[PDB]
From a paper:
Hazara virus (HAZV) is a member of the Bunyaviridae family of segmented negative stranded RNA viruses, and shares the same serogroup as Crimean-Congo haemorrhagic fever virus (CCHFV). The genomes of CCHFV and HAZV comprise three negative sense RNA segments, named small (S), medium (M) and large (L), which encode the nucleocapsid protein (N), the viral glycoproteins (Gn and Gc) and the viral RNA dependent RNA polymerase (L), respectively. As with all SNS RNA viruses, these RNA segments are encapsidated by the nucleocapsid protein (N) to form ribonucleoprotein (RNP) complexes. Genome encapsidation by N is required for multiple stages of the virus life cycle, including replication and transcription of the viral genome, as well as segment packaging during virus assembly.
We have determined the crystal structure of HAZV N to a resolution of 2.7 Å and found the structure of HAZV N to be very similar to the structure of CCHFV N, supporting the use of HAZV as a model for CCHFV infection. The crystallographic asymmetric unit (AU) contains four HAZV N monomers. In each of the four HAZV N monomers in the AU, only 475 amino acid residues were built into the model; residues 187–196 are missing in the electron density and are thought to form a disordered loop that links the arm domain to the N terminus of the globular domain. In agreement with the circular dichroism data, HAZV N is mostly alpha helical (helices are numbered according to Fig. 4b) and is composed of two distinct domains, a globular domain and an arm domain. Interestingly, HAZV N and the CCHFV N monomers in the AU of all three CCHFV N structures are packed in a similar way, with the base of the globular domain of one monomer making contact with residues on the arm domain of the adjacent monomer. HAZV N has a positively charged ‘platform’ adjacent to the arm domain (left) in a similar position to a positively charged platform on the surface of the CCHFV N protein. Superposition of HAZV N with CCHFV N strain Baghdad-12 reveals that the globular domains of these proteins align extremely closely (RMSD = 0.70 Å, over 368 residues that share 63 % sequence identity), as do the arm domains (RMSD = 0.89 Å over 107 residues that share 48 % sequence identity). The arm domain of CCHFV N is rotated by 74.0° around a pivot at serine 297 when compared with the arm domain of HAZV N resulting in a translation of 27.1 Å of the tip of the arm domain (the Cα of Asp 266).
Numbering used by the authors: 1 to 184, 197 to 485
The structure:
């Protein structure tokens, strides 16, 4: 049981990877990172087999067989190997020994048993999301685009082929409808947007009346207005609002001779109260509670290993387990038996972290540290695409759902990412009742693809904008 991907620095890993890549002839023709993808799999045969299937096990077998076929050869071999390497493994686990007692980790880890049943508070999500960015900085996880924090804007348009466009619009429409269920004075929004975007002198002339006028709810209209702008455009609006209010202070002190200093101070104290009231409403809202529960794949992966008592000695058994798991068409219930039956100790402890039975609320709200049967794909993509005890076996191929994000987005090669996502959705709706399911995996794959997530190992919590507002073309 030796981890054969030996590399304790960025430079030592590159010497391993270039040696591995030129051996196996890794192909970046159809994928974003270099992979074993020599062709785009045509999955329509599974959609038609699914139409004819009668029992639930057959549909599970057809659906998993479709996912294996789709994903087995197209894993990001650079980023997978980087996550699984001896350096990243030792540093990644030991961070939790170093950081468990801090504010950003303890709020969710010490309450793990509570979060298995209950939905988390808003600050526990913010704690998690800070700790994830701390983990990436302290370990030094970024070695390029596909392992970095994304700080980009959401794109205005998303370019899909003509053969799939109709089904992509049905998925997005269902995502819009799902966004509306979790959620549940017209020029005010346009004025509040103008103010936040930089026109700070608007605050002297609020169209409703005084700057701190309360609406029907009893909350300031500037707070309500900024809070609704968070739900429509994203939490980037509150960063812009704080930048505008700073300029308002700068102008009032630059031009004290033009103003009544009492009413200027009553204005600035009023705007700061409405800003904090807008933060309180945004965190309290369901739109944030879903957004904040976004899993950082590799961070939560390493958290679950540390929670199950895994060390650098026992890591290769986990990597080897996840590799073999992604080869056979395995239903989620069969995997639970495999973790029970395996004599290794982590196998038992990892099954006890599952929260499949006892979570009554909507699963989108579940805190992203809690493991489930579906979230084993987060571990599978992290450590399972390349087995560390025998790296060459990767050429066989190990299917993981998060390997679909490695497919290209470019119309030059027919946009294989959108075609696989579209085809997988047709397979799911044919076999399973879609609106009964809380999270549909193909809709979750599309949501990441829309916001510009090109790899499972990227963090994308700090993306400016919404996937909901995008146009399909």
């Amino acid at each position: 049981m030796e981890n054969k991907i030996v590399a304790s620095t960025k430079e030592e890993f590159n010497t391993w990877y270039k040696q591995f890549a030129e051996k196996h002839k890794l192909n970046n023709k159809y994928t974003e990172s270099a992979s074993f993808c020599a062709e785009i799999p045509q999955l329509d045969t599974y959609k038609y087999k699914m139409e004819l299937a009668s029992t639930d096990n057959e549909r599970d077998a057809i659906y998993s067989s479709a996912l294996i076929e789709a994903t087995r050869f197209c894993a990001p071999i650079m980023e997978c190997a980087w996550a699984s390497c001896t350096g990243t493994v030792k540093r990644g686990l030991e961070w939790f020994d170093k950081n468990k007692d801090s504010d950003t980790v303890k709020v969710w880890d010490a309450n793990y048993q509570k979060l298995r049943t209950e939905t988390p508070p808003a600050e526990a999500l913010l704690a998690y999301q800070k700790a994830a960015l701390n983990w990436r900085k302290d370990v030094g996880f970024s070695i390029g685009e596909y392992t970095s924090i994304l700080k980009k804007a959401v794109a205005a348009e998303y370019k899909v082929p003509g053969t799939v466009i109709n089904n992509i619009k049905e998925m997005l429409s269902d995502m819009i409808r799902r966004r509306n269920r979790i959620i549940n004075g017209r020029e005010h929004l346009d004025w509040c947007r103008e103010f936040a975007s930089g026109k700070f002198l608007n605050a002297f002339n609020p169209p409703w009346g005084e700057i701190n006028k309360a609406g029907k709810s009893g909350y300031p209209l500037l707070a309500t207005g900024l809070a609704k702008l968070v739900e429509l455009e994203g939490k980037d609006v509150m960063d812009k609002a704080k930048a505008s209010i700073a300029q308002l202070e700068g102008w009032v002190k630059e031009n004290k001779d033009q103003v009544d200093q009492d009413k200027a101070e009553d204005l600035l104290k009023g705007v700061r109260e409405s800003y904090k009231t807008a933060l309180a409403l945004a965190k309290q809202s369901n739109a944030f509670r879903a957004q904040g529960a976004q899993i950082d794949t590799v961070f939560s992966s390493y958290y679950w290993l540390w929670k199950a008592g895994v060390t650098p000695v026992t890591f290769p058994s986990v990597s080897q387990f996840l590799f073999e798991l992604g080869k056979n068409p395995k239903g989620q219930k069969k995997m639970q038996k495999a973790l029970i039956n395996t004599p290794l100790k982590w196998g038992k402890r990892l099954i006890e972290l599952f929260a499949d039975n006892d979570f009554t609320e909507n699963r989108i709200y579940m805190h992203p540290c809690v493991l489930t049967s579906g979230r084993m794909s987060e571990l599978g993509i992290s450590f399972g695409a390349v087995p560390v005890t025998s790296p060459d076996d990767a050429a066989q191929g190990s299917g993981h759902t998060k390997a679909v994000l490695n497919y290209k987005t470019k119309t030059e090669v027919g946009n294989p990412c959108a075609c696989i996502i579209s085809s997988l959705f047709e397979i799911q709706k044919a076999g399973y009742d879609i609106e009964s399911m809380d999270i549909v995996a193909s809709e979750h794959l599309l949501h990441q693809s829309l916001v510009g997530k090109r790899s499972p190992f990227q963090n994308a919590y700090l993306i400016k904008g919404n996937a909901t507002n995008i146009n399909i073309i």
